[PDB]
Design a binder for this molecule. Sequence first.
Ligand SMILES: Cn1cc(Cl)c(C(=O)NC2CCCC2)n1
Ligand SMILES: Cn1cc(Cl)c(C(=O)NC2CCCC2)n1
Ligand SMILES: [Zn+2]
Ligand SMILES: [Zn+2]
Ligand SMILES: [Zn+2]
Ligand SMILES: [Zn+2]
Lengths: 75, 69
Amino acid sequence: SQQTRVLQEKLRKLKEAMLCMVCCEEEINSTFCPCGHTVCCESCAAQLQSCPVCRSRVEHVQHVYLPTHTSLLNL
Amino acid sequence: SQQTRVLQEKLRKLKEAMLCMVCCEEEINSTFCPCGHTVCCESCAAQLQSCPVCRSRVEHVQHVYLPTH
Ligand SMILES: Cn1cc(Cl)c(C(=O)NC2CCCC2)n1
Ligand SMILES: Cn1cc(Cl)c(C(=O)NC2CCCC2)n1
Ligand SMILES: [Zn+2]
Ligand SMILES: [Zn+2]
Ligand SMILES: [Zn+2]
Ligand SMILES: [Zn+2]
C-alpha cells in the first residue's frame, strides 16, 4: 500500500543517516575528540586535522561500537 | 498489507537499537572511554563505574553528536 512506501522511505533515511558523511559508503564508527562529532568511518576520520562539522582541532579519534552496526567491517 | 506490518517492525527495531540499554527511555548519546561501547544515555552513563557491555573501567564519558539525533 502507500503506507508501505512511506515506511520504506523512513527506514531508508534512518539508514542513510548512519553512513559516513565523507565517503557515503561505510558505517559511521569514529568520534572526533574532544568535540564529539561522530560522522565518519575509520578511514575518512584518520586523515582529518579539524572536525568537518565544527572546525575544532581533532586531538584524537575514538572508535565507537554502536548497537545499530550491521556492516561486515564492524562485526 | 503484511509487508506494511513487516516494515513497521523493522523500523521499530532499528529505533529500539538507538535507545539506552539501561533505562530504555532516552536516545544513546554517550561513549564509555577507552573501551568505546556507545550504548547509554548521558544520565545512565554518569552513574556507571564499569562498562555494562565489557566490564572495562570507565575512565571518562565522551558525549557523541550523531546525525540520527
Ligand atoms: C551519507 N549518506 C547520505 C546518503 Cl543519502 C548516502 C547514500 O545513499 N549512500 C549510499 C552510496 C553507496 C551505498 C550507500 N550516504
Ligand atoms: C533499549 N530498548 C530496547 C527496547 Cl525494545 C526498548 C523500548 O521499547 N523502549 C521503550 C520504553 C519507553 C519508550 C521506549 N528500549
Ligand atoms: Zn568514510
Ligand atoms: Zn566537531
Ligand atoms: Zn539511560
Ligand atoms: Zn565496554
